[PDB]
């Protein structure tokens, strides 16, 4: 236990007074060698805690802000009284960190670290002397204007920020995030320029540093690559491809290094300067270090008019060539007929009721407008769209046929989504009837995209070498890759008229291919959303006035914007590659589009020279410019930039910009949930090359998970509360290892968190008894089936109860009751007694039968991701990277091929697991509640194919429990021939459920032993026949511990 040692040492630092006492609370598994639950703390003298210890670190000179480096007047670091004159006009939304942790908490987490490492040995001393020279700059600037005391909900009022500079809080937050990631001398020279210059230059610093990364991935030679097959399976190929670069790229890379010297950066353009002499892959992680560090400057929060002015003001002309727009509109028309040819001819059940298909899946839509609703006696304000339907279905206003206009009378409100170092993107806020019309038709466009080679939904898995590995499979010395960066994709001229009229023309060739009266109707309503968006006005508020701007283009926030933007690229890059073939003769190997970032691999006849690269790039940005789409045409021979991934020289490099101590939107979480987002943003940045200290993170989990009931008492939970596998998990003991503990007091506490895993909310039980909720449930049972049954109607009325957990105040009355019920268990050490099978109860019976021995494995495979940590790179080089991805979606089964066809619901794999192990007449009672007819659910039960479907659901459910497809286990090959020489388990037939879990648990204990220690072990399990039958009856009653904030911990982006 190491977190318990830092927890006791922290409270002896922040409470320096004599009146502070700490009472540890212990507990045991027996009645009468004990692990501790929490640590009490009574401290009374608490005024001026941080402002007294800051003065001993405030030396040197403070930073004087430069006031003539930004174009706008409210982006400079001026005094707030000089910027906002009165307290009535004070906008917090330009500097708000939007995290529930104040600046006075972040300064104690550094001053606690600087005391523990004040007198270390000569290797760890140089890290301390580099993190002290940076903290002198941060402390002496804050101490001049003082420390701003936060609000009760962690905002900053006007009266505490009156005499300070405006961005003092949101600069001291990001600079503490940067100085706690300095490890080498190269990391100290980057952090000094991004701390000094970031005090004045709040506009164009993250753009100048992160600019030359699209160029530098085209200079590094390839010597050995990973490729992928036609089906997505990995291969290793060791060709040699030379990098060819024209003389105008180096005349552009020299321009990017002289823009970085006008801004004042004088030691970041010396590392790129000294790397270009070699152009080597062995020094390239220095060039991705500078690209990853540039995103930690901070967010560019601006006014909504001032950030949507260059986007909404474009020059549309009629001096384009109209001969090129006829082929562009025809190629969009040919795709929509090609996508909906099979679900319209054979009339699918999903298109026949598009009104019901959007109603039962409106929890996937974006948040709409803020509207006043009335649910019985209560009056609530909500932006979720399925709450707008329950108010509109009661008052006699629910008309899904009539689609409202978005012209000058009723404009479209606008929301933003921004990323540091890029421009901002606007998001439409559409009514709730643009989601119902565009859901059953777009879902038929995204099943064709999962079987077509040129789209992005084909190469969409959990791994990252199998998805973006088709870039380098066509690479040779006679080919070139052509990745182009369209600047303003949203409002270009090729998107307003010919894109909406290419879809409308494609839905008129599908109104003559069918014979039902319903499929003509759902293809007419999807056509009606395109004529109304042909002339759309947008609404942007500024000051007193509200501006209405005409905007006939395509923005995000729609439903079709992920599958119809991919059609407009494959029709536009097919027209440009046909105009460039009048000067050259090639053969297009692959085209692959993902939104608005794409590539295309052209294979030439003769060898590629330096003249065929400079003159193809001048025929891409001159053919695009004939269609009024200005682009930055880039061609390369070795490496590209596919979407946020940088494949340079055979290796794949990611970006590591995730802001830990800042956020872009004010989230609706608690502190306990944002202490697991802060940890899971540290594991992501550690795997990509931005290593923050662990002891700064573990200090930040101490200051966020603690909760007080009185102003003098504090409760700090221990390691065994936060690390155990339950609802309340925050972090793990070792970093990349998910451990399931097996001790008689560790299963005793995991069952003790099973009582208060389900709490009730006082808001959702008053909505569910109101009259307008019963009117919404009653009119869904009419459309779902023509009959009336009492079983299906309670099965519907208790399904929209869980849909109200997406509402933000309802999902906060549960979580505020989780932590307030935990405090009665951390104070009273005795708990309750119950029995319920978890995953740890199964592993209690398997672990005493494994015998370990020492073993060795020589390295045989090489590394394709060179920014991974050292203990994970020993696993990959010894057992191999993943070759093929095993699916856990369950759609290969025969019950998930029946639910998806005959109904619109989607049941969770934790729901299909519980019902597949019951009798025949219990699967019947469940399948009718899904919407399946009685004659179909009598077929599947009466066919006895559920007996052979028991093992296709348990295979995909155990892979979800142990998190094999997600986490950091999605890199190692599990069917490798080098893990089977270590696992030696004799085979005993006729029980497949137990033999499967003996080989999946033995494969994890060998991997989790070689990350902790770096040495391999071999296992042997002579499991008896009398213990296999006892474990066989517990493989079906296993229950999982699901949490809402943990479902985001499975994916990276």
């Amino acid at each position: 236990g190491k977190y318990n040692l830092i927890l006791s040492e922290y409270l002896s630092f922040i409470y320096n007074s004599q009146s502070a006492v700490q009472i540890p609370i212990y507990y045991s598994s027996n009645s009468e060698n004990a692990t501790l639950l929490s640590i009490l703390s009574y401290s009374y003298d608490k005024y001026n805690a941080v402002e007294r210890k800051l003065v001993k670190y405030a030396k040197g000179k403070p930073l004087e802000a430069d006031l003539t480096v930004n174009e706008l007047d409210y982006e400079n670091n001026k005094i707030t009284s000089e910027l906002f004159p009165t307290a009535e006009e004070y906008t917090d939304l330009l500097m708000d960190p939007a995290i529930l942790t104040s600046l006075s908490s972040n300064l104690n987490a550094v001053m606690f670290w600087l005391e523990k490492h004040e007198n270390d040995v000569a290797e760890k001393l140089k890290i301390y002397k580099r993190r002290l020279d940076l903290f002198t700059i941060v402390a002496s600037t804050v101490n001049k204007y003082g420390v701003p005391r936060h609000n009760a909900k962690y905002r900053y009022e006007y009266e505490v920020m009156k005499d300070k500079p405006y961005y003092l809080v949101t600069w001291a937050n990001s600079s503490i995030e940067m100085l706690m990631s300095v490890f080498s001398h190269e990391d100290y020279l980057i952090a000094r320029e991004l701390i000094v210059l970031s005090y004045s230059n709040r506009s164009t610093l993250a753009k100048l540093v992160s600019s030359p990364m699209s160029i530098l991935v085209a200079l590094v030679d390839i010597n050995g690559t990973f490729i992928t097959n036609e089906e997505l399976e990995l291969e290793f190929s060791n060709k040699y491809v030379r990098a060819i670069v024209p003389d105008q790229t180096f005349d552009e890379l020299k321009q990017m290094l002289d823009n970085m010297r006008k801004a004042g950066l004088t030691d970041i353009p010396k590392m790129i300067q000294d790397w270009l002499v070699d152009c080597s892959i062995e020094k390239f992680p220095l060039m991705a270090k500078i690209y990853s560090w540039s995103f930690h400057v901070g967010f560019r929060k601006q006014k909504m008019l001032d950030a949507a002015l260059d986007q909404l003001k474009t020059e549309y002309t009629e001096d384009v060539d109209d001969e090129m727009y006829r082929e562009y509109t025809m190629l969009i028309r040919d795709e929509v007929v090609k996508m909906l040819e099979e679900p319209v001819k054979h009339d699918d059940h999903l298109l026949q009721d598009s009104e019901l298909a959007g109603l039962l899946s409106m929890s996937s839509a974006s948040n709409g407008e803020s509207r006043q609703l009335k649910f019985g006696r209560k009056t609530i304000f909500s932006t979720k769209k399925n709450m707008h339907v329950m108010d509109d279905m009661a008052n006699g206003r629910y008309t899904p046929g009539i689609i409202p206009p978005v012209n000058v009378d009723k404009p479209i409100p606008l929301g933003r989504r921004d990323v540091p170092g890029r421009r901002t993107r606007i998001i439409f806020i559409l009514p709730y009837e643009y989601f119902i019309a565009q859901h059953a038709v777009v879902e038929k466009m995204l099943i064709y995209a999962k079987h077509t080679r040129e789209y992005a939904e084909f190469y969409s898995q959990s791994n990252q070498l199998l998805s973006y590995g088709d870039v380098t499979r066509f690479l040779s010395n006679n080919s070139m890759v052509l990745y182009t960066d369209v600047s303003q994709w949203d409002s270009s001229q090729h998107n307003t008229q010919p894109f909406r009229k290419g879809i409308i023309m494609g839905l008129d060739m599908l109104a003559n291919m069918t014979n039902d009266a319903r499929v003509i109707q759902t293809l007419n309503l999807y056509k009606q959303t395109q004529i109304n968006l042909m002339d759309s006005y947008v609404q942007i508020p500024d000051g007193n006035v509200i501006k209405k701007i005409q905007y006939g283009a395509v923005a995000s926030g729609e439903k079709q914007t992920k599958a119809a933007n991919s059609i407009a690229n494959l029709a536009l890059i097919k027209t440009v590659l046909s105009r460039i073939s009048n000067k050259y003769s090639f053969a297009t190997k692959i085209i692959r589009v993902d939104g608005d970032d794409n590539y295309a691999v052209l294979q030439f006849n003769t060898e590629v020279t330096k003249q065929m690269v400079q003159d193809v790039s001048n025929d891409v940005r001159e053919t695009y410019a004939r269609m009024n789409t200005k682009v930055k045409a880039l061609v390369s021979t070795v490496g590209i930039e596919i979407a946020k991934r940088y494949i340079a020289g055979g290796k794949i490099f990611f970006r590591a910009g995730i802001n830990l101590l800042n956020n872009e939107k004010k989230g609706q979480s608690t502190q306990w949930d944002q202490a697991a987002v802060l940890y899971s943003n540290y594991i992501v940045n550690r795997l990509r090359g931005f290593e923050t200290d662990r002891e700064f993170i573990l200090t930040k989990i101490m200051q966020m998970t603690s909760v007080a009931i009185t102003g003098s008492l504090r409760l700090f939970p221990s390691e065994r509360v936060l690390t155990t596998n339950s609802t309340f998990k925050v972090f793990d003991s070792e970093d990349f290892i998910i451990e399931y503990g097996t001790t008689d007091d560790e299963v005793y506490i995991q069952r003790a968190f099973m009582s208060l895993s389900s709490q009730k909310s006082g808001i959702a039980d008053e909505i569910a008894a109101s009259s307008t909720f019963k009117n919404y449930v009653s009119r869904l049972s009419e459309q779902l089936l023509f009959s009336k049954n009492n079983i299906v109607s309670r099965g519907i009325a208790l399904t929209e109860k869980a849909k109200l957990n997406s509402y933000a105040p309802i999902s906060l009355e549960k979580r505020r009751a989780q932590i307030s019920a935990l405090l009665t268990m951390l104070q009273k050490p005795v708990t309750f007694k119950s029995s319920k099978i978890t995953i740890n109860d199964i592993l209690r019976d398997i672990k005493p039968f494994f015998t370990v021995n020492e073993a060795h494995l020589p390295i045989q495979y090489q590394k394709f991701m060179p920014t991974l940590p050292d203990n994970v790179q020993y696993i990959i080089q010894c057992i191999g990277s993943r070759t093929y991805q095993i699916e856990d979606d369950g759609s290969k089964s025969a019950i998930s091929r029946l639910i998806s066809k005959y109904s619109v619901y989607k049941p969770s794999i934790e729901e299909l697991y519980k019902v597949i192990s019951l009798h025949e007449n219990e699967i019947q009672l469940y399948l009718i509640s899904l919407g399946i007819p009685k004659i179909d659910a009598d077929t599947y039960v009466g066919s006895k194919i559920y007996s052979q479907d028991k093992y296709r659901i348990l295979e995909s459910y155990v892979y979800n429990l142990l998190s094999i497809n997600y986490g950091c286990y999605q890199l190692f090959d599990f069917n490798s021939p080098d893990l089977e020489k270590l696992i030696r388990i004799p085979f005993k037939g006729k029980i497949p459920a137990v033999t499967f879990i003996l080989h999946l648990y033995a494969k994890l204990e060998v991997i989790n032993h070689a990350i902790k220690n770096g040495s391999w072990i071999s296992l042997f399990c002579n499991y008896p026949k009398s213990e296999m039958i006892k474990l066989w009856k517990k493989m079906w009653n296993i229950t999982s511990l699901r949490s809402p904030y943990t479902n985001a911990n499975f994916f990276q982006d």
Partner: peptide
């Protein structure tokens, strides 16, 4: 009261019909 709670498991319906092996 969800539907997954009300439907009884296979081991519950195997106890309303009793017999001894030997």
């Amino acid at each position: 009261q969800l539907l997954e709670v009300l439907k009884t498991k296979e081991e519950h319906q195997k106890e309303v019909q009793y017999e001894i092996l030997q």
